[PDB]
Structure 1
């Protein structure tokens, strides 16, 4: 039951983490910092989800 919740929480994290890169694209090179963080955070969400 908890794994089913972690899978859901991990799935939602990919949604919010995905939007982080969208908002960072508006800033351009200035928002490149959040792009790297959003890229890694989005990857960790998949690793935690697949795990």
Structure 2
């Protein structure tokens, strides 16, 4: 998530460098747009993993009461 944030801040700096380069920066600016899009997408994928971790840990919390019940039955 930090690496994705760092990528977005780097892309913001890169856009200014592309603007300074003018005619020569035009293709680089298009690439920088995709770098912004990937930085957002990487963060979204990382969040999908967090949702799965939350569900999985939720299964551990449900499992813990079942394991205690298994210890008693």
TM, length-normalised to structure 1 = 0.76
Q: How many residues align?
A: 45
User: Runs of 5+ in structure 1 lacking a partner?
Assistant: 1-6
Give the match's secondary structure for 2:23.
coil
Q: Which runs of 5+ in 2 are unaligned?
A: 45-72
1:12-45 superposed Cα distances (whole Å, 9 cap, x missing partner): 1100011111100012122101100111011100
Higher RCO structure, 1 or 2 (CA under 8 Å, sep 6+): 1
Radius of gyration: which is bigger?
A: 2
Give every structure 1 segment of 4 or more consecutive aligned residues whose post-TM-superposition deviation is greater than 6 Å: none
Following superposition of structure 1 onto structure 2, how do residues 1-51 of structure 1 map, counting pairs within 5 Å?
7-50=1-44
